[PDB]
Each structure stands twice: as structure tokens, then as C-alpha cells.
Amino acid sequence: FADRTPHPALTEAKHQQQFFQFRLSGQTIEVTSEYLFRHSDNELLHWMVALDGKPLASGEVPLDVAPQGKQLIELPELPQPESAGQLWLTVRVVQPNATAWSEAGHISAWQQWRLAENLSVTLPAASHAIPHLTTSEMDFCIELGNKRWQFNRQSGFLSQMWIGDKKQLLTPLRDQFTRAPLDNDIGVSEATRIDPNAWVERWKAAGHYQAEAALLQCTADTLADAVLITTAHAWQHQGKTLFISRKTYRIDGSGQMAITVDVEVASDTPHPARIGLNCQLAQVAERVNWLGLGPQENYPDRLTAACFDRWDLPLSDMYTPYVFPSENGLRCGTRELNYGPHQWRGDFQFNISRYSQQQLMETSHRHLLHAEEGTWLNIDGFHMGIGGDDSWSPSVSAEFQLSAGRYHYQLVWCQK
Amino acid sequence: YQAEAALLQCTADTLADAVLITTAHAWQHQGKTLFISRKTYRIDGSGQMAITVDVEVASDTPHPARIGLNCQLAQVAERVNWLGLGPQENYPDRLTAACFDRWDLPLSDMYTPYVFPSENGLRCGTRELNYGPHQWRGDFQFNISRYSQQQLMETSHRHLLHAEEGTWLNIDGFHMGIGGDDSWSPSVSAEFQLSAGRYHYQLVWCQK
């Protein structure tokens, strides 16, 4: 920023430009120096092995590597854990002494890898309680304990949840296919000249920002130990069907709601910016806790610098205050997200903030944004790349466009 | 090639207009779980069985060659009719020459008689497959023949293959590339390896 505070992209540049390169082969790390002139004489290697965020082993090895040379580092016999989960190895190079340009403890390079994984073969504990379905003309209602879920039969969306008598939502949980456009999506360098190839112009012409959901199907069933709700929706613009969404919600005896989503995208509409859900939660909590890539904002084509771990930040750090407001704050590769009493599990991307995608789209300056009631949560199965080879022509590479035609993802929403 | 399936779950429910069967299986070798498969079968009033499959693959096992189903059908029909890429054999990294259309061939053209027997005969990008009275719909790859994968693996020469009873059908959600930059080192590019960790696909099996 003009006051010399960093954008989140500065950390991506730091990692890609590091002077040490690392390879892992079994138990050996190979450290290669990209210095031309100096020996590594102010460097030590911290390693750590963790299992789904919880630490298991650590260590430090002093680096002694000639300019353009290699050093092999053998790790001690790693622990075999009983429990299920992915093991991660993380190395960081730390400078123990101050320089002319850095403080003591400056981290100059890092790298992360997956080691062994144990898949969970334990079937969930069978609960005695059965959730109760009630059916009016307007609604399906599911009660279990103090918990309640309500699905509106005209819209076919989850419209409210209660814990006790405390309502949890301010807006229903609905599909989302759009983002507040980034500067690379707008694709303008001269304010007098408009490109029709720009992502935002293609999305606007096709009607993605205006598409209205039509309900196709909405039904409810009692199984032995669960309630199943099944919905389908079509998004249309002027006769043309752009997207179809088929969902199942399965509410079991433990109180966990499992959501399964299957989406079809017309092959001739421009590829959507995202495929996910959004809602506005009634509460405002101080912290956000997640297990996945961080701690900084990261996108599918800018995530090499983020590391998988357990992160905890205050809510205001989950928003990036770009001077011209846009989509911001995404965290990728997430397995678990905790916010107040809510927990979401899956394999997803999310952003969480006090500003809707709509408010970010209609406001031209950050100082004119005002916090909305509650918190806006965007949970995505899939998200387009952000580009940036330049900003005045389309620049998202084809491997980061959402061009597969069929998409599938699942979440579990529960109360921790 | 040795992994044994262990049953985790198998339950049945009557819905308003359908029956739902739900299964889970773990494939193991010496304590280590290699794959987990969760399936639903939903049999409705029109007689269509809808099958939904979700697979997890351990990150540290080598990427599998395919993710799909197989069975041996009792009947032997003369023709195979499909809507998808053809008419020749095509694989995920060798399909640029095949065109999407409606193809009809005799069963013996669905097998490629390579002198040293191997996996052969795959057709990709398929939306519909008709064989005798059966129809399968989805978005899948298939091969159909009189030889099991096991017989093709254990036999060294094509002239020693013998037709089995009925027909062997392999239906795949996903299939690895075949390589061929050379034949004496690994040569399948990373975009054609099955490295995603989680896989999902669905079929409808019905009688036409």
C-alpha cells in the first residue's frame, strides 16, 4: 500500500524468489543454494512434522552449503501415529543473527510436503434419537433436541435454523455463481476504452449477475435414522438455462446436516467465477479458526506460498482492504472451519466478512464500505483463478477456468 | 492387484417412490487402507437404477490405473451401440482423433488383438451405451469383451486367449493415460494421472 503495508501477493513473491530450493526423497531433504557468492553462514533449518494441525516432532539442523552447492539432511525416524489423518512435513530457513537489513530470527525460505496418510475407516457412533419431520404447505420443519431447521417449499432453500429460540440466519442458504469483479476481470487500462473479451463484460452479457432461480423439485423423506430433503433449481436468463443445481440435505441423529451438491453448467455460457453457497449468519464472533491453507488470503492460482496448518485470526484479518473493493479474503484447501458455535467440514474454499458480494461490487472506494448486520459466509466447491499476466486482456490460464461442465462437492454443517 | 474389500456398512430404506441401498467398503493390504468406496443405489418406479459412487484414495499409495465398476453379464449380443467418442479405441491421452457421434459395431470390433494381450478397447466420453436389453447413461468410459482383466494379465500371447461365458463390462468414472514418450521409463504426464485424492461419478442402469 502507499503507506508501505504489504498486500497478500508480496508473500507469494517472497516464496517464489527464495534463495534455497528443497527436494524430499523418503527421509532425506536435499537443500540447494541459489547464492552465487556467499556460503550459508547465518542460516539454520527448522523442521516440523504435524498430523492435521497437531505437532508430533521437530528439530533444527545448521545449514552448511557452498554457493550453488547441495546438502543432504537425514531426518530422524518419524513417529507412526495410530489415528487417521494426513502427516505434513514443514521446513523453514531462519537467520539466527541480525544483518544490516534484517532482525534476528528472520525467515528467508520455506517448503511443505505431504507424508503418510491413514484413511478413516471408523463408522460414526449410532445415536438413539430420530429427528422429527413436520410438513405444512409453506415449509418442511425438522426438530431434534433444541435444534430446528426450516426449508421454505416455494423457494426450496434452507430459510432458518434455531438453537434454543435463537435464530441463526438473516438470509437463506442459496447457490452462488458470481464474484465481485477483480481488476483483472474488468480488464481496462484506459477509462475511455471497453474490451468485450473482458471476463466481467462476458459475465454481464450472459446474465450471470441477473440470473433468477426457478424451483424444479422439493421433497422430504423419513429414513430409519435421518431426514432427507431433495431440491433442484434452474438459473435462467431470457429463456436460456445457464446452471442446474441438485442438492440433498441429510439431517441425522447426532445433529449434523450433510449437504451434497451437483451442478451442471451450459457449455456455451462463459465459465462461471465460482460454484458454491452463501448465507448471512445472524451472529458476529471475534475469531475465525480453520484447518487448511493460510494464514494469508490465497487463490487457486496463487497458493504456493500458503502452508496447510491450523490457523486462528481475528475476523478483521479475514478481509483485505484493497483501495478499490473486490472479491478478497479467500482461503483454499480447507478441511474444517469454526466460527462461533458453527463448524463446517469438507474440502472447500471460503471467505468470511461483514460485506456482501453486492456491496463490494457497487462501491468504488474502501472508505465508503459499511459493515452489514451479521457475517457473510461464502463456501465454494470451486473457484476460478485471478490472472495477472496483465490487467487489460483476459489472463487466467485454461487449467484455472471452471470448464468441466459437471461439478460435485459436499459439506457437513454442525454445532460444536 | 491383491487388495481385499471389507464391508463397512450396508442398509436399505423405503422412500415415497423408491428404494435406497447404501454401502461402504475399504480395500486393504496388510493393515493399510488403500481405497474407500461409498455407493448409493436408488431404484425408482420406472425401473431405472441410479448408482452414485464416491471414492477416496490414500495420498501415499501410487495413483490407481482406473476408478470404476465391473461385472460379467450372462448374455452375448452381436452389436454394441454407443453415443460418445469413436469409432476406434481411445484413451484420455489419445482421444484427439475420435469424434463424438452415434456408433454401432459388432462385439468383436470392440477388442483390439494386440499380440501381447493387455488392457484394450476403451471408449471415452460416452453418454449412453446399449448392449442387448441393457442401457447405461452417465459420463463415463467403457470397454466390453469376452476376456476378463485377469485372463489378459496371465496370458502372454493372443492365440492362447479363450472366450469366457457371457460378456465382461468395465465402466469407469476415470482412467489413467497410457504414456508412450518411451516404453522403458514412466512416461504418463501428470495431467493424466489420477492424483486428485477424491472422485465422484454416477450411472443409470435400465432396460430398454
PDB file of C-alpha atoms in Angstrom, chain B:
ATOM      1  CA  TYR B   1      -3.733 -56.455  -7.532  1.00  0.00           C
ATOM      2  CA  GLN B   2      -4.213 -58.256  -4.152  1.00  0.00           C
ATOM      3  CA  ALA B   3      -6.366 -55.767  -2.158  1.00  0.00           C
ATOM      4  CA  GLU B   4      -9.369 -57.399  -0.375  1.00  0.00           C
ATOM      5  CA  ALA B   5     -12.643 -55.473   0.112  1.00  0.00           C
ATOM      6  CA  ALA B   6     -14.005 -55.253   3.697  1.00  0.00           C
ATOM      7  CA  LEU B   7     -17.667 -54.285   4.207  1.00  0.00           C
ATOM      8  CA  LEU B   8     -18.213 -51.258   6.494  1.00  0.00           C
ATOM      9  CA  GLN B   9     -21.944 -50.549   6.006  1.00  0.00           C
ATOM     10  CA  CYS B  10     -24.997 -51.993   4.124  1.00  0.00           C
ATOM     11  CA  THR B  11     -28.524 -50.608   4.747  1.00  0.00           C
ATOM     12  CA  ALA B  12     -31.867 -50.269   2.929  1.00  0.00           C
ATOM     13  CA  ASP B  13     -34.733 -47.747   3.097  1.00  0.00           C
ATOM     14  CA  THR B  14     -38.155 -47.302   1.557  1.00  0.00           C
ATOM     15  CA  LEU B  15     -38.733 -43.724   0.352  1.00  0.00           C
ATOM     16  CA  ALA B  16     -42.117 -42.495  -1.009  1.00  0.00           C
ATOM     17  CA  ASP B  17     -41.435 -43.636  -4.607  1.00  0.00           C
ATOM     18  CA  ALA B  18     -38.067 -45.515  -4.453  1.00  0.00           C
ATOM     19  CA  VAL B  19     -35.842 -47.909  -2.549  1.00  0.00           C
ATOM     20  CA  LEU B  20     -32.403 -46.665  -1.387  1.00  0.00           C
ATOM     21  CA  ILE B  21     -29.471 -49.060  -0.705  1.00  0.00           C
ATOM     22  CA  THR B  22     -26.305 -47.555   0.844  1.00  0.00           C
ATOM     23  CA  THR B  23     -22.904 -49.343   1.039  1.00  0.00           C
ATOM     24  CA  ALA B  24     -19.335 -48.605   2.111  1.00  0.00           C
ATOM     25  CA  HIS B  25     -16.185 -50.725   1.530  1.00  0.00           C
ATOM     26  CA  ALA B  26     -12.470 -50.450   2.419  1.00  0.00           C
ATOM     27  CA  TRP B  27      -9.756 -52.073   0.310  1.00  0.00           C
ATOM     28  CA  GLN B  28      -6.854 -53.217   2.450  1.00  0.00           C
ATOM     29  CA  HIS B  29      -3.421 -54.707   2.106  1.00  0.00           C
ATOM     30  CA  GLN B  30      -1.573 -55.719   5.312  1.00  0.00           C
ATOM     31  CA  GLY B  31      -3.267 -53.205   7.662  1.00  0.00           C
ATOM     32  CA  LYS B  32      -3.011 -50.233   5.244  1.00  0.00           C
ATOM     33  CA  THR B  33      -6.311 -48.930   3.780  1.00  0.00           C
ATOM     34  CA  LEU B  34      -5.706 -48.129   0.075  1.00  0.00           C
ATOM     35  CA  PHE B  35      -9.196 -47.019  -1.139  1.00  0.00           C
ATOM     36  CA  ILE B  36     -12.666 -46.315   0.368  1.00  0.00           C
ATOM     37  CA  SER B  37     -15.833 -46.535  -1.742  1.00  0.00           C
ATOM     38  CA  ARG B  38     -19.318 -45.218  -0.689  1.00  0.00           C
ATOM     39  CA  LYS B  39     -22.226 -46.094  -3.003  1.00  0.00           C
ATOM     40  CA  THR B  40     -25.952 -45.365  -3.192  1.00  0.00           C
ATOM     41  CA  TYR B  41     -28.381 -47.333  -5.361  1.00  0.00           C
ATOM     42  CA  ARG B  42     -31.738 -45.765  -5.867  1.00  0.00           C
ATOM     43  CA  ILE B  43     -34.349 -47.956  -7.602  1.00  0.00           C
ATOM     44  CA  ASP B  44     -37.398 -45.930  -8.718  1.00  0.00           C
ATOM     45  CA  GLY B  45     -40.871 -46.755 -10.131  1.00  0.00           C
ATOM     46  CA  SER B  46     -39.847 -46.564 -13.809  1.00  0.00           C
ATOM     47  CA  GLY B  47     -37.331 -49.379 -13.166  1.00  0.00           C
ATOM     48  CA  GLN B  48     -34.187 -47.260 -13.546  1.00  0.00           C
ATOM     49  CA  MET B  49     -31.452 -47.980 -11.021  1.00  0.00           C
ATOM     50  CA  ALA B  50     -29.359 -44.798 -10.299  1.00  0.00           C
ATOM     51  CA  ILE B  51     -25.875 -45.579  -8.884  1.00  0.00           C
ATOM     52  CA  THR B  52     -23.778 -42.848  -7.177  1.00  0.00           C
ATOM     53  CA  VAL B  53     -20.136 -43.591  -6.275  1.00  0.00           C
ATOM     54  CA  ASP B  54     -17.704 -41.598  -4.051  1.00  0.00           C
ATOM     55  CA  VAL B  55     -14.102 -42.819  -3.764  1.00  0.00           C
ATOM     56  CA  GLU B  56     -11.168 -41.810  -1.524  1.00  0.00           C
ATOM     57  CA  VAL B  57      -7.579 -42.809  -2.430  1.00  0.00           C
ATOM     58  CA  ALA B  58      -4.743 -42.758   0.212  1.00  0.00           C
ATOM     59  CA  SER B  59      -2.278 -39.970  -0.824  1.00  0.00           C
ATOM     60  CA  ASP B  60       0.827 -42.169  -0.326  1.00  0.00           C
ATOM     61  CA  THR B  61      -0.258 -45.214  -2.423  1.00  0.00           C
ATOM     62  CA  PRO B  62       0.746 -44.972  -6.160  1.00  0.00           C
ATOM     63  CA  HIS B  63      -2.097 -43.399  -8.228  1.00  0.00           C
ATOM     64  CA  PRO B  64      -4.561 -46.136  -9.352  1.00  0.00           C
ATOM     65  CA  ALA B  65      -4.917 -47.171 -13.058  1.00  0.00           C
ATOM     66  CA  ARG B  66      -8.723 -46.663 -13.032  1.00  0.00           C
ATOM     67  CA  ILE B  67     -11.728 -45.914 -10.809  1.00  0.00           C
ATOM     68  CA  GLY B  68     -14.799 -47.849 -11.936  1.00  0.00           C
ATOM     69  CA  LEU B  69     -17.055 -50.916 -11.787  1.00  0.00           C
ATOM     70  CA  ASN B  70     -17.001 -54.256 -13.495  1.00  0.00           C
ATOM     71  CA  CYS B  71     -19.291 -57.255 -13.864  1.00  0.00           C
ATOM     72  CA  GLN B  72     -19.807 -60.274 -16.116  1.00  0.00           C
ATOM     73  CA  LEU B  73     -23.192 -60.190 -17.893  1.00  0.00           C
ATOM     74  CA  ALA B  74     -24.872 -63.562 -18.645  1.00  0.00           C
ATOM     75  CA  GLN B  75     -25.812 -62.742 -22.268  1.00  0.00           C
ATOM     76  CA  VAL B  76     -23.775 -62.429 -25.507  1.00  0.00           C
ATOM     77  CA  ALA B  77     -25.198 -59.946 -28.056  1.00  0.00           C
ATOM     78  CA  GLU B  78     -23.951 -59.331 -31.620  1.00  0.00           C
ATOM     79  CA  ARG B  79     -23.726 -55.490 -31.679  1.00  0.00           C
ATOM     80  CA  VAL B  80     -22.681 -52.678 -29.328  1.00  0.00           C
ATOM     81  CA  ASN B  81     -24.316 -49.260 -29.799  1.00  0.00           C
ATOM     82  CA  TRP B  82     -22.933 -46.156 -28.028  1.00  0.00           C
ATOM     83  CA  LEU B  83     -23.146 -42.378 -28.023  1.00  0.00           C
ATOM     84  CA  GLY B  84     -19.661 -40.928 -27.388  1.00  0.00           C
ATOM     85  CA  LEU B  85     -16.104 -40.801 -28.846  1.00  0.00           C
ATOM     86  CA  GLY B  86     -15.229 -43.381 -31.558  1.00  0.00           C
ATOM     87  CA  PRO B  87     -15.396 -45.471 -33.554  1.00  0.00           C
ATOM     88  CA  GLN B  88     -11.861 -46.623 -32.701  1.00  0.00           C
ATOM     89  CA  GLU B  89     -10.383 -47.419 -29.245  1.00  0.00           C
ATOM     90  CA  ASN B  90      -9.464 -44.124 -27.474  1.00  0.00           C
ATOM     91  CA  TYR B  91      -7.806 -43.214 -24.118  1.00  0.00           C
ATOM     92  CA  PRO B  92      -7.707 -39.948 -22.084  1.00  0.00           C
ATOM     93  CA  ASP B  93      -4.326 -39.019 -23.590  1.00  0.00           C
ATOM     94  CA  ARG B  94      -5.048 -40.396 -27.115  1.00  0.00           C
ATOM     95  CA  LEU B  95      -8.567 -39.160 -27.982  1.00  0.00           C
ATOM     96  CA  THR B  96      -7.981 -36.112 -30.262  1.00  0.00           C
ATOM     97  CA  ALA B  97      -8.722 -38.215 -33.399  1.00  0.00           C
ATOM     98  CA  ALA B  98     -12.030 -39.671 -32.122  1.00  0.00           C
ATOM     99  CA  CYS B  99     -15.296 -37.801 -32.854  1.00  0.00           C
ATOM    100  CA  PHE B 100     -18.459 -37.633 -30.721  1.00  0.00           C
ATOM    101  CA  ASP B 101     -21.329 -39.382 -32.529  1.00  0.00           C
ATOM    102  CA  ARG B 102     -23.593 -42.456 -32.509  1.00  0.00           C
ATOM    103  CA  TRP B 103     -21.540 -45.594 -33.271  1.00  0.00           C
ATOM    104  CA  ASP B 104     -22.575 -49.192 -33.899  1.00  0.00           C
ATOM    105  CA  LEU B 105     -20.027 -52.019 -34.210  1.00  0.00           C
ATOM    106  CA  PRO B 106     -20.109 -55.838 -33.878  1.00  0.00           C
ATOM    107  CA  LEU B 107     -18.792 -57.092 -30.485  1.00  0.00           C
ATOM    108  CA  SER B 108     -15.502 -58.433 -31.985  1.00  0.00           C
ATOM    109  CA  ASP B 109     -14.511 -54.878 -33.167  1.00  0.00           C
ATOM    110  CA  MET B 110     -14.611 -53.705 -29.517  1.00  0.00           C
ATOM    111  CA  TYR B 111     -11.497 -55.792 -28.784  1.00  0.00           C
ATOM    112  CA  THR B 112      -8.029 -54.860 -30.149  1.00  0.00           C
ATOM    113  CA  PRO B 113      -5.995 -58.067 -30.762  1.00  0.00           C
ATOM    114  CA  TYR B 114      -2.538 -56.823 -29.634  1.00  0.00           C
ATOM    115  CA  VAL B 115      -0.076 -59.777 -29.982  1.00  0.00           C
ATOM    116  CA  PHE B 116       0.926 -59.390 -26.307  1.00  0.00           C
ATOM    117  CA  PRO B 117      -2.514 -59.125 -24.506  1.00  0.00           C
ATOM    118  CA  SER B 118      -3.226 -56.013 -22.351  1.00  0.00           C
ATOM    119  CA  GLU B 119      -5.987 -53.551 -21.381  1.00  0.00           C
ATOM    120  CA  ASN B 120      -7.527 -52.594 -24.769  1.00  0.00           C
ATOM    121  CA  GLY B 121     -10.754 -51.404 -26.359  1.00  0.00           C
ATOM    122  CA  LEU B 122     -11.640 -48.407 -24.089  1.00  0.00           C
ATOM    123  CA  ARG B 123     -14.045 -45.833 -25.483  1.00  0.00           C
ATOM    124  CA  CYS B 124     -14.074 -42.428 -23.698  1.00  0.00           C
ATOM    125  CA  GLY B 125     -16.530 -39.540 -23.351  1.00  0.00           C
ATOM    126  CA  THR B 126     -19.568 -41.835 -23.506  1.00  0.00           C
ATOM    127  CA  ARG B 127     -23.094 -40.654 -22.614  1.00  0.00           C
ATOM    128  CA  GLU B 128     -25.104 -43.788 -23.458  1.00  0.00           C
ATOM    129  CA  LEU B 129     -24.273 -47.464 -24.027  1.00  0.00           C
ATOM    130  CA  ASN B 130     -26.747 -50.101 -25.332  1.00  0.00           C
ATOM    131  CA  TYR B 131     -25.973 -53.838 -25.159  1.00  0.00           C
ATOM    132  CA  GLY B 132     -28.742 -56.402 -25.674  1.00  0.00           C
ATOM    133  CA  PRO B 133     -31.657 -55.231 -23.460  1.00  0.00           C
ATOM    134  CA  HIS B 134     -29.415 -53.096 -21.131  1.00  0.00           C
ATOM    135  CA  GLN B 135     -28.807 -49.322 -21.269  1.00  0.00           C
ATOM    136  CA  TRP B 136     -26.260 -47.332 -19.193  1.00  0.00           C
ATOM    137  CA  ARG B 137     -26.320 -43.500 -19.042  1.00  0.00           C
ATOM    138  CA  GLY B 138     -23.826 -41.119 -17.460  1.00  0.00           C
ATOM    139  CA  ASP B 139     -20.492 -39.574 -18.462  1.00  0.00           C
ATOM    140  CA  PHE B 140     -18.068 -42.475 -18.428  1.00  0.00           C
ATOM    141  CA  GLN B 141     -15.502 -44.679 -20.262  1.00  0.00           C
ATOM    142  CA  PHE B 142     -16.119 -48.334 -21.000  1.00  0.00           C
ATOM    143  CA  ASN B 143     -14.755 -51.445 -22.582  1.00  0.00           C
ATOM    144  CA  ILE B 144     -16.740 -54.577 -23.327  1.00  0.00           C
ATOM    145  CA  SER B 145     -15.345 -58.004 -24.297  1.00  0.00           C
ATOM    146  CA  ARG B 146     -15.230 -61.794 -23.768  1.00  0.00           C
ATOM    147  CA  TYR B 147     -11.906 -61.635 -21.784  1.00  0.00           C
ATOM    148  CA  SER B 148     -11.517 -60.666 -18.081  1.00  0.00           C
ATOM    149  CA  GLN B 149      -8.751 -58.289 -16.976  1.00  0.00           C
ATOM    150  CA  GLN B 150      -7.345 -61.354 -15.125  1.00  0.00           C
ATOM    151  CA  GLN B 151      -7.156 -63.576 -18.248  1.00  0.00           C
ATOM    152  CA  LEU B 152      -5.483 -60.696 -20.217  1.00  0.00           C
ATOM    153  CA  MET B 153      -2.900 -60.305 -17.408  1.00  0.00           C
ATOM    154  CA  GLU B 154      -1.922 -64.010 -17.084  1.00  0.00           C
ATOM    155  CA  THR B 155      -1.732 -64.865 -20.864  1.00  0.00           C
ATOM    156  CA  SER B 156       1.395 -63.941 -22.889  1.00  0.00           C
ATOM    157  CA  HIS B 157       0.134 -64.472 -26.495  1.00  0.00           C
ATOM    158  CA  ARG B 158      -3.172 -63.528 -28.203  1.00  0.00           C
ATOM    159  CA  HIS B 159      -3.644 -67.019 -29.723  1.00  0.00           C
ATOM    160  CA  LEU B 160      -3.899 -68.542 -26.205  1.00  0.00           C
ATOM    161  CA  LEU B 161      -6.891 -66.330 -25.097  1.00  0.00           C
ATOM    162  CA  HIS B 162     -10.245 -68.199 -24.820  1.00  0.00           C
ATOM    163  CA  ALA B 163     -13.685 -66.535 -24.677  1.00  0.00           C
ATOM    164  CA  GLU B 164     -15.311 -66.700 -21.253  1.00  0.00           C
ATOM    165  CA  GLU B 165     -19.088 -67.292 -20.670  1.00  0.00           C
ATOM    166  CA  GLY B 166     -21.058 -64.083 -21.168  1.00  0.00           C
ATOM    167  CA  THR B 167     -19.506 -60.641 -21.588  1.00  0.00           C
ATOM    168  CA  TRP B 168     -17.164 -58.657 -19.292  1.00  0.00           C
ATOM    169  CA  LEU B 169     -18.164 -54.965 -18.938  1.00  0.00           C
ATOM    170  CA  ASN B 170     -15.795 -52.384 -17.399  1.00  0.00           C
ATOM    171  CA  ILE B 171     -17.444 -48.992 -16.726  1.00  0.00           C
ATOM    172  CA  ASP B 172     -15.052 -46.275 -15.484  1.00  0.00           C
ATOM    173  CA  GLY B 173     -15.578 -42.853 -13.991  1.00  0.00           C
ATOM    174  CA  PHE B 174     -11.860 -42.164 -14.512  1.00  0.00           C
ATOM    175  CA  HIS B 175      -8.905 -43.797 -16.308  1.00  0.00           C
ATOM    176  CA  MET B 176      -5.121 -43.129 -16.271  1.00  0.00           C
ATOM    177  CA  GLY B 177      -3.225 -42.128 -19.501  1.00  0.00           C
ATOM    178  CA  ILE B 178      -1.304 -44.788 -21.491  1.00  0.00           C
ATOM    179  CA  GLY B 179       2.035 -42.942 -21.928  1.00  0.00           C
ATOM    180  CA  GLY B 180       4.488 -43.631 -24.732  1.00  0.00           C
ATOM    181  CA  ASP B 181       7.258 -40.997 -24.892  1.00  0.00           C
ATOM    182  CA  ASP B 182       9.267 -44.181 -24.386  1.00  0.00           C
ATOM    183  CA  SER B 183       8.486 -47.657 -23.024  1.00  0.00           C
ATOM    184  CA  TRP B 184      11.346 -48.254 -20.533  1.00  0.00           C
ATOM    185  CA  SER B 185      10.685 -45.470 -18.021  1.00  0.00           C
ATOM    186  CA  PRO B 186       7.459 -43.891 -16.572  1.00  0.00           C
ATOM    187  CA  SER B 187       6.039 -41.583 -19.272  1.00  0.00           C
ATOM    188  CA  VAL B 188       2.451 -40.726 -18.302  1.00  0.00           C
ATOM    189  CA  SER B 189       2.268 -36.919 -17.891  1.00  0.00           C
ATOM    190  CA  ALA B 190       0.959 -35.555 -14.534  1.00  0.00           C
ATOM    191  CA  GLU B 191      -2.329 -34.158 -16.017  1.00  0.00           C
ATOM    192  CA  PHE B 192      -3.322 -37.795 -16.948  1.00  0.00           C
ATOM    193  CA  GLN B 193      -2.512 -39.408 -13.554  1.00  0.00           C
ATOM    194  CA  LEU B 194      -5.381 -39.960 -11.092  1.00  0.00           C
ATOM    195  CA  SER B 195      -3.899 -37.858  -8.282  1.00  0.00           C
ATOM    196  CA  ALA B 196      -6.949 -35.817  -7.036  1.00  0.00           C
ATOM    197  CA  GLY B 197      -7.476 -37.941  -3.827  1.00  0.00           C
ATOM    198  CA  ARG B 198     -11.357 -37.727  -4.123  1.00  0.00           C
ATOM    199  CA  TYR B 199     -13.520 -38.932  -7.030  1.00  0.00           C
ATOM    200  CA  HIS B 200     -17.240 -38.894  -7.759  1.00  0.00           C
ATOM    201  CA  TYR B 201     -19.363 -40.351 -10.620  1.00  0.00           C
ATOM    202  CA  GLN B 202     -22.882 -41.634 -11.331  1.00  0.00           C
ATOM    203  CA  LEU B 203     -24.634 -44.028 -13.722  1.00  0.00           C
ATOM    204  CA  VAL B 204     -28.177 -45.009 -14.531  1.00  0.00           C
ATOM    205  CA  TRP B 205     -28.653 -48.706 -15.394  1.00  0.00           C
ATOM    206  CA  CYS B 206     -32.038 -49.519 -17.039  1.00  0.00           C
ATOM    207  CA  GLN B 207     -33.759 -51.921 -19.511  1.00  0.00           C
ATOM    208  CA  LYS B 208     -34.514 -50.548 -22.990  1.00  0.00           C
TER     209      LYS B 208
END
